[model samples]
Target: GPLGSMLKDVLTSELAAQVRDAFDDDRDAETFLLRLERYGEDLWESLRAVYGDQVRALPGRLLEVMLHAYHARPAELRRLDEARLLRPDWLQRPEMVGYVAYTDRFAGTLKGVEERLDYLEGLGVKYLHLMPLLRPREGENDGGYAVQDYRAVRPDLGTMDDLSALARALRGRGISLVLDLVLNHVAREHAWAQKARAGDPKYRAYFHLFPDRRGPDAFEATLPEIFPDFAPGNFSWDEEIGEGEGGWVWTTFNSYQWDLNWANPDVFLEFVDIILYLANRGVEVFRLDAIAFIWKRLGTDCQNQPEVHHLTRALRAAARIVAPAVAFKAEAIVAPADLIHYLGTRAHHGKVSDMAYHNSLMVQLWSSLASRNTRLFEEALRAFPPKPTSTTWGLYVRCHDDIGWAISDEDAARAGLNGAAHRHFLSDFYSGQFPGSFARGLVFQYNPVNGDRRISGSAASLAGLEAALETGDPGRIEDAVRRLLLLHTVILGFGGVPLLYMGDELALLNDYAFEDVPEHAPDNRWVHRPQMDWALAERVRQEPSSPAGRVNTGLRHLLRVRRDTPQLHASIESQVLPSPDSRALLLRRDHPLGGMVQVYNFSEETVMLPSHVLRDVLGDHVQDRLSGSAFRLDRPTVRLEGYRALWLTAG
Candidate 1:
C-alpha cells in the first residue's frame, strides 16, 4: 500500500514543515518537497516492511537528514543528478567499462590518482571503483574494511578535500567515482564503539552487545564461520562493557570489526546521512560492502534475510530522491538464488541495487578454463535467475579477493560432475599443486573443517603467464596470453560493465613479497594485489612481442570492440546456446540492429565449430568482430584456435 493517500498526506505535511524550517528560499523548499512527494512513498513502504510500526516516526527524522543533505549538496553534483534522471539507462550502455584499484597502490596518494587519469581514460574506463580508502583502525584492519571513520579519508591517501578534488578530476574525464561503504560493521576504535565502551547507553544500542554467551551460543549454532582459519568464533568478549555477565560482541569477519545492530532505527538514519554526505562530495557509485550480513534473525543463518533487501531498497530510495546520479552496487557474493535478490524481486523489483557482482560468471570462467569444458559453465549460467533490466552486473575475471569456488553441488551433479571433487581439483590446479599445472598461484584460507582451499593469484599468474615466462617457452607464452584474453572476451561480451583489475592490463603477476610487509603478512590475498608498475607499462607500450605487451594490446583491442558493439549493451540478456563441442561455449544476444552469436574455444587444441551453428543463428553471411573476417559458405566448419573467441554477426 505505498499509494495510500492518508499516509502520503501525513508524510507530505511533515516533509513540508521540515523543508520550510530548513530552507530559506521558497524555490529550494519547493524542489525538496516535490522530490519527497515523488520518492517518499517508496521509501516509506520499504522501511515499513522492515521496521513495521517503528516507521511512523522514522520518516520525520530521515527527512531532516535528507533535507540537510540537499542543502549541502554541491551545485555540480546536483546538475549531474538532473542529467542522470533524464537518462537512467546511461550505465547499461555498451561503452561503460569499469576499472578497480587501491588508491595508494595504483598511485601514491589522491593527487597521484589525478595524475593517472590519462592512463584510465586510455583504457576506455568510464567507471572507476577505488577500493576502501576510508579511515580504518590502525594495524590488522582487514584491508580498510574495519572503518573507524566514515566521513574522513585515510591520512596516508589524502584528506576529504583531496577526495572531493579527485572525484571532480575523475568526473571531468567522464568517469564515475565508486567507493566502498562498509555496511555491516565498524572498527572497535570507531567513536560509536568507544562511546559504548564508556557506558553510554545511547551508543551501546548501536551494536549487538549481549551480556553473556546465552544469545551468542544460540546464534553460533546456526551461523557459519566466515574466516574459520583466522577469526574462528563469531562473538568476542569485551570485559570493559557490561561488568556483570561479561559483554560479548558479534564479529562476523574479525573481532575488531563489530557488527552494527540494524534493528535499531538510528543505525539506518546514520547510514542515510553518510550516503548523502558522500554523494554530495561527487561519489556517484557506492559498493555496499558486506551487505548480505546486515539483518539477523534467530534460529536461522543470518544471511540473505528478507529484511536485508528491504533495508537496501529503502536506502536506494533515499539516495534516489536526493542524488539520482549515485547508484548502489551490492557487494553480496552469495549463491545465485540469494544473489538475484540484491538486485531485487517481487514487490521490491528494480528497487534495490543498480548493480551486483556476477560472481557466477567469474567462477564458471575459471572452472571452464581448468576443466577445458563448458558443461558446468553452461549449467551454472542457465540456472541463474534473470536479473532486472534496469540493473547491471559487475563482471570481472578477477578482483581484490580470493576465488571461493562457489559451485553449487546440485548444479555440479546435473553437469555430470561431483561438486566437492571439482572444487578440489580447481584449487589444486590453480594453486600449482596438481600435476602438469601451469598456474603459479598460492593457497589462501584453507578451511580444514570443510576442506575448502581458495586460490590467490593475479589473472596473468593464475592463467599460466608466470610459469610460461619462467620456462622461456614461446608456445606456452602464447597459450597463456590467449587464455588471459579469452577470459576478458567473455566478460566484455557477456553483457555487463567489465571491470579490469588494477595490474591485469599489462599482465602483472603475483606479488610474492606481500609477506615482507608485517601488516599484510597474515592475508595471502595480497599476493594478487600487486602495485602498479609504470615502468613495465612503458615497456608494454614499446615491446609488442613480450607477454605483457601482447596482453595489453589484445585487451585494449577487446575493449575497443566492446565499445563499438551495440548488441553487447547490458540491457540485452544473453542466451547460452548448446554447443556441439564440449570445449566450445556459445552465447546468443538478440538486438534490434542484428542478432549476434559469440563462440569461445576453451581448450589448448584448436576446436572446430560447425558453420551451421553460426548460419542457423545469423544466416549464411557472418562477420567476425574480433578478426574482421567474413565466413565463407564453402567452409563446412569454422576453425577456432586454442583459447580464441569469435563474435559473429550477420552483415
Candidate 2:
C-alpha cells in the first residue's frame, strides 16, 4: 500500500513520546506494548484493504488522534485495573428490574428523566436502559440508530454535560446507566464524512468508498439487504463524486449510514477513545448495536465472523483496563445458535461480553403467542447450553427496533416450515389479517421481493388487545389481557434480569397518535413510543380494579415474591422440573437454602398437573403462593386456568 512505508518513521517517534509521558504510571506498560506489537500487522493489513493506498502515510496521525481523544478518560478509567480484582457480580444483584423507555416518552428531556429516579428506585429497579439518546440526523432519524456524532447529545434532550449530570444522579440513586452504541454504521452527516467529502486524506479512513463500480458491484453480490423497501442497495451511489473516487459508499442499513472500516487499527482506536470518554461520564453499560455486521468477508454473510469477536474482545479488554465499572451488551439478533456467540460459551474462548439480550427466548415467546403451543418453548429452553456462571442474560420483550424475522433456519426446516413464508405469516398475523388473529401490529421495513417484513407495536397491541377492543368482545379482551400478564410473568421469573416495557405496567395500549406528531408519523414504532400518560399511571395507582392497575399490581406481586424467593437469582444450583405435557412449563428454583416449583399454562383451555408429579418432587407438603392454599397428595389433580401461572413450594 502507498501509505504503509511512510508510517514507520511517523509512528515510532510518537510511540517513544507516549511511553515517556506515561512512564511514571506504567503498571503493565511492557505487556501492553507486546500485545500491540503482535497485533499491529493484521490491523495494518485490514486498514489497507479498506483504505487502499492510504494506510502507510497516516498511521502515526491516526495514532495521535486516538491518544488525544482518549486523554479525556477520567481517573476511574486510568485506575480501572484495581477494580477488576474486586469484580462485582453485577448481573446477580437482588434488585435487578430493568425498564426500557424512550427519553421523550418517559419525560420530555434528560433532566425530566432525572426527576424519575425516585419512581424507578421505588419499583426496585437498579438498571436504567434509556435507549438511543445520541444525536441523530434530523428528519426520520432512523430512531437515533444513525449517529451524527459520537460524543454529542441531541439538543432537545440536553447537552453532553447534562447527560453527565443525569448519570451522576442515577448513580447516586443506585441505578446503572446504559446507552446504545450503534456500531454497524454512521450517519453521512458525521464530521468524518463531511471531511472525507472535502477530500481530506486523514478523514478518508473513516468509511468505505470505492474508486469505481467494479468493487462495489462485487461487494453487493455478497451483502444482504437490510432496508430493502426504501434503501434497496447496500451501496448508494453519489454520482457527483465521479468514478475516480467511486460514487458508492458502504451503507448496510440505509444510504446515509456509511459503514465504518473497522479493519483499520485507527478505527479500533477511535472506538476505544470514545468508550473511555463515555466511561468518564459514568456510563456503566453500552449496548453494542448490530455488532454482528461489523466484520465483512468477500463471499461470506459478513456477520458473526471471528474477527468481529476479536474486535469485541478488544473493546471488552479496553473497558476492563480503562473503566472497570462499565460493561458491554452485545446486540446479536440473529439465530439462537449465532446469538449464543454474543453471550459466549465454553467453546468460544474470548472476552466477547458478560451480558447480552435473550433475543432467542423473546422470539420463541412470539412463537408461543402465534400458535399457543409450548413445544417450541420447551425445546428452546432445553436447548439453552449453560452460560458461564459469571454471565447472565438480559431477558427482554421489546425495544425501539422492528421485531426481528430471524429464527434458526435449520430448526424451521426440521419443523416442516418455510422460514421466509413463516416470517410473512407472523407479520400478517400480527397486523390482524389472518382470521382469529388477536394481534394488532403494523408492518415495518416490508421487503416486496419475498414479502419479508417485521412487526411493530407495543406488547398490548401485538399481544391481542387491539383486535379484542375493535370487536367489542369483552370476553376476548379479558383473555388477551391475561395472555399479556402471563407472558410477562414468565419472563419475570424466567431466571434472568426481566425487563418491562415503559408504559406496560399501566396497560397503556398502543397509541396511534403518532399520526398527529409530525416528527413521528413516518415511523410506526412511535406508535408504541407514545407519551407517558400520567392519567393512565394515576388510574393504575388509584383504582385497584382497573385492568391497567391489575397487571401492574400483579407484576408488583410477582416481583415481590421473586425477591423473597432468593433462589430466582441466576446460579448453577437451580433445578428444572420435567414437563408432563407440551402445555406445561415446569421449573424448580433449587438451592441448598431452599427452592420452589413454578407452573405456567399458556393454553386457552384449562389443564391439570397430576398430583403424583408434584408430590414426587415436592413430596406431601406444599403450598400455593397465589391462592394461599395448602395441599395434600391425596388430591388427584391440580387445575390451572387459561393463561395462568403459579409458584408452588414446601418447607
Candidate 3:
C-alpha cells in the first residue's frame, strides 16, 4: 500500500524538532503543529512517491517553512484560517457567486477594482478571480501567464500593496479574491530562468533544459502542440549569446513560457513560498494554472501523469498547514476522465483542490446550442465522475480565453453521434462557416495538421446577438437574448459556484478592436476580453426588452433566485438525466429541502417534456423559479419556449 507508515516515525521526529525550534516561543503554535503532524505523512507519502529517497527531506523542510509562514501570517488571516478550518464548506454556500475579470480591463487598476466593489456587489458576486495581475515579461507575456515576478503586481494594475489593499476591501464585502499561480511554468525572464541563463547549475535544474534535442524530440513524438499558430513546437534552443551552457528548453505553450521541472523538490519549495506569500497578502484562492503538464515522464504524453497529483497533493497539504482559509482551484482543462483526477477521488478525495473549472459543461453547452441536440451532452456528463463533496465546479459560460471544442469520440459514439464529424461541425458552426449559422465568432489557433480549431468571441456574439442585431429582426433578437439567458441558467443552477465571465451578463459583443492593437493582434481570443462598458451597464436594466436589457435583467433574476435557493449550493448532488425530448437538456439537483429539475431548451423550436418524465419528483405541485410561475399536472406536457429554461421545484 502507501508508504506513509514507513516514514511516519522519522517524519514525526524531524517535524517535531523543526516545529518546536521555530514556534516554541508562540503558545498558539501547537494548533498548527498538530495539523502538521496529522497531514505531514500524507504530504510525505505523496512527495516521496514521486521523488523517492532523493527528496526524502522534503517533509521536514516543508514543515519548517509552514511554521515560518504561520508566524508572518496576519492576525485577521489567521482568524480566517480558524473559521475556514471549522467550516471548510464556506466556499460551497448558496451565496457563493464568482465574477472573473482582467484588472486593467475591468477597472483600470487595483485601486480602480476596489472602487468598483459596489458594481460587483450589486450583482451579488461573492468570489472574484483577478486573472494574472503579476508582473510579466515586457512583450507578449502569454497574456500575463509568463510571470517575471510573483511578488509584484503588474505596474499598470497596481503595486503589491495596492493588491493587498484591494484584497482587504474585497474581504470586507464578503468576497474572496482569487489569483493565478502558474505552477507548470515560468517566463524565461523570471529570476530563476535568468539564473539558469547565467549558467547557475542549481537554478538550471529548476527547468527542463537539455544539451541537445534528443530528449525533447523523443517526448515531442507523443506531446501535442499547445499553440500551433504563433508558438509551435515543444522545445526552443537558447539564443547563441544568451545560451546558459547551451541547451534546448521545454516550451510547452510558447518559447518564453518555460515549463518548470517539478522533479526537483526545490521547485515545490519555491512555489510553497509563493503560495504562502500571496495567501498572506489576503488572496483567498490560488488558481493553479496549466497544472496538467507539470510532471514529465518519457515514453508517453507527459500530461496528467500520476506524479502530477502527487505534486498537487503535496502542494495542497503544505498550503493547508499554513493557510487554511486559502483554497486551490485546478485550471486543468483536460477530458472529463482526466479532469476528475484533478479534483481527486478515492483516498485523494477532498484533498487535491477546492474547485475546478467545469470546462466540460462549458463545451457541452455550446455544443448543444450549435447542434440543437442534447443526446451527446447528456451522455458525456453521465459518463463523467461526480466531484468530491468538499469541492465545487467553477461553472461559467465563457471566460477570458477562447473556447476549444473538446468532444470525445467515445462519448459521441455512445450518443449515436460521430465525434470527429461533430467536432468539425461545432468548429464550422461557431466560426460562422456552416450554412444557416448565426454565430460571429473568430477562428483561433486553427491547426492545419490535425484540422484542430478553436473559436473565440464574446458570449453574446457566439449566442447570435451580434447577428440578430445586425438583421434587425425582433424575433431573431429575442431568440438570441433567450439563448444567452439559457446558457447562464444552466450554469447557475448546476450545483456549483456559477462564475460570470465579465461583461457577459451585459450581453457584450466581440470587440473587433483587438486586431488594431499590436500586442493583442496575434491572439483572436482577445476579441472577447473587452473593456467593461459602464455606460451600457448603467442603462441595461431600463431597456429590459433590448438585447442587453433582456440578458442583464434575466441573469440578475437568476442570480437572485440562486442566492435564495439552498438547493443550488455546491455540496448537493447533481445528476444529468436523459431527456425525452432530444432538443431539451435535463438536470436534476437533489437537496434536503426538495429536488430542483432544471430543463433547458437547446433548439430554436419549442419543446415539450411529458409530465410523467418528472414522476420521480415526490410532489404533484411544481413551481418554476425562473419565471415565478406554476404549472399543474392538469396538462399532459410542460411546454418550453425556444431557448427557455425552467428551474422547477417539485414534490
Candidate 4:
C-alpha cells in the first residue's frame, strides 16, 4: 500500500514536470502516465518481492527510465500502442498466422526482408519472427543469441536505423516484427562485460565471478550440460575477469556468452531500458531467449527460480506502461510444469509473458508420428496444467533449433511406455538408425552418459521427404507430403499462433552444406536452417502437382481454412480426446461459432472410427470442413485415409 501511494505521487509529479517542460500534449502523455499508474503497483510489488530492502531506490530509478523511454518513443509507435490496447485480444484471433526465418537466410538483410513482405502477405502471415539480427561476437554467436549490444543491429544484417525502417515497413503491411532479445546472457565482447573485465567494481558485479572452482563445481553438480559435446561445463574460466589472476564466469550457454547476474538490480534496470528502446523502434514482439536460466541460487539447478517470474512480471509491467503494443514471448523450452510459469502462475497470472512455445505439443506430435500411436501424445496433453486465458501459445512443427525429445518419465508411464526407451526410439527413428525408418535427420548433441540424442533436420526431411525423394516412389512421396501437411494442420488448428518456419512453405529439405562451412559445421542445427529457395518457390508456384508443390499448396489451403475458422482462436481451449483407433489422434474445440473436431491418421494405414464419435461431439449432421465432405450416417464407421486430417463440424 505504501508503494502504491508513493507511485501515485510519483506519477502526479512526473505529469506536472512533463507539462511544464512542454513535453506533454495533455492527451498522449496523460494516457501513458495513466498506464504507469495502473501497472505501477504490480511493478513495485514484484520488485520488492525480488529485491526486498534493496528495492527502495529501484522504484525511482525505474520510473526515470520509463519516462525517458516514453518520451523517446516514436509517435507512430505510440499510436500503434493505443490501437493494440483497444484490441487487447488481437494476437489471440484465429486470423493470426506466424512465419519465422533468419534474416540473412530468409532474404539477405533488413531491406531484403522488406522486399519479401509480399511473400509473407501471400502466405497470410501477420506475425514475422526474424531470428537474432542483433550485434553479436564476431565468430559463432550461438545463432546470434549472444547479444553484444542491445541497441545495435548486426553490421552484416544492417544498421539499427535500417531495422527501424524495416519494422515500420512490416507494420504497414499488418505484420508484427518479432526479434530475439538474449535475456540470459550477453556476448563477452559486450560493453558491460568489457567494463567488468577492466576491473570496474560496479560493472564487475554485473556477472557471477569466482576466484576458483569451489563455487563453480557446486553449481555444476546440479546444472545440466546444454552443449555437452562442445561446451562441457556450466562455468568458463576467464583470465581477464579478476585483477590478472583470472576468475570463473558463469556461462550457461557458451564460453563467450557470459551469464548476467540478475540478482543485481542494475541488470534488471538495464534490460527494462533495452526493451523499451527496442519497442520504440517498432519491434512488436520480443522472443525472450533462454529465459529460464536468469535467476540463480546455491545447491540447485539455478533455473526456473521464483525470482525469474518476479523479474519478468516487473519487466512486463514496465513495458505495459510505456509500450502496450510490444509483447514478450518466452523461449523457455523446459518441462511442462516449469514452462507454464513463464506465461504465468498463481500471483503472476497473465502478468509475465504474452506467449510461450507449446514445446510439449511439438514433442508429442513427433512422438506419435514415430510410434504410430496417440497414447503418448494423448497422455502428455491431458497432463498439462491449464495456462492463463489471456496468454497464447507459440505452436510450431520445427524451428531454427534442434529437436530434443523432452518426454517426461511420468507421462510416458501413463501411456504404458518406458520414457527413456521411447526417447531413444524417437532419436533412432528420426536419425534413420532404426530399421525401416523413412526419416533422414542427423543426430545433434548426443550425450553418451545418458544416451540422449537430439535430431536436426528440416520439417520435410524429418517427415521422410528426403528419404521418399531418394526412393523415387510416388506412394512414398505422397505419404511424406501428407505427413508434413498433417503436422502443419495440427499446429494451425491447435488454438495458438501457428508458426511456419522459413523454407517450410516450399518443403525445403535438409541443407547438408553446413557441413562444409567450418563456422557452422559444429552445430548440426544449421542443417535445418537452410537458405530460402526462391527458385524452388517459383517452380512450385507453377507445378502444384509435384511433391514440394503439393506441400506448399496444401499448407496454404490449411492456413486459409484456419483463418476463416473462428473456433481456431487461441482464446478457445482445445480438448485432446482419446481416440478409439490407436493410429488416430482427436482434438476438439468448442467455440461460440460451432463445435469442431479435428481427427488425424498418424500411420500409413487407413483408420476407422465409429460414426457415433462424430455424432457425440457434434450433432448427427457432421461434415469435414477441410474437404467439405458430409459424414454419411448411412455408414456405421467414419473412414480416414492414411495421414489424412479431418476438420469435422456441424453441417
User: For candidate 1, lDDT tens digit of each residue in 1-651?
Assistant: 767878767766876787788888898888777877777777887888889999888877888788778888989998999899898988899899999999999999999999999999999999999999889999989888999999999999999999999999998999999999898999999999999988899999999988888999999999988887668878988887764655899999888999999998999999998899889878999998989999989988898888898899889889878888999999887888789889877453436899999999999999999999999988998888888788899999999999989999988998899999999999999999999888998888787877878889999999999999999999999999999999999999999899899999989999999999998998889999999999999998888768899899999999999999999889888889988899999999999999999999999988878778778879888899998998864478988889879998997
What would the per-residue lDDT of candidate 3 be over residues 414-474, giving only the tens digit for each residue? 9999899999999899999999898999888889889988999999999999999999999
Q: Tell me, by lDDT, which candidate is best.
A: 1
TM-score of each: 0.97, 0.87, 0.97, 0.96
Clashing pairs in 1: none
- Candidate 2 lDDT over 1-651, as tens digits, reads 659657666676566566446435564455334434544444454455555676556456544543443455665544543453475675665457888888987988999999888888877787888878888888867778888988888889998889989987887787778888887788888887777777786777777887767877887777778788658878887653432644778888878788898876667767877787777777878889889989878787688887776677666655544345778888886666666667666652444687888887778778777866665565556556677677778887776667876665555654466656666777888887899888888888776766677878888888877777778887887887787888787777777777777987776777888888786776787877767887777777788676667778877877776666666676442344767766777777765755678787867778876878777777887887765777786588888878878777884
Q: Which stretches of candidate 2 lie over 4 Å from their true place?
A: 1-87, 240-246, 412-424, 516-519, 573-578, 624-628
lDDT of each: 0.90, 0.73, 0.86, 0.88
Better of 1 and 4 by TM-score: 1
Q: Candidate 3: which pairs clash?
A: 617-651, 618-651, 619-651
Ranking by lDDT: 1, 4, 3, 2
Q: Which stretches of candidate 1 lie over 4 Å from their true place?
A: 1-8, 346-350
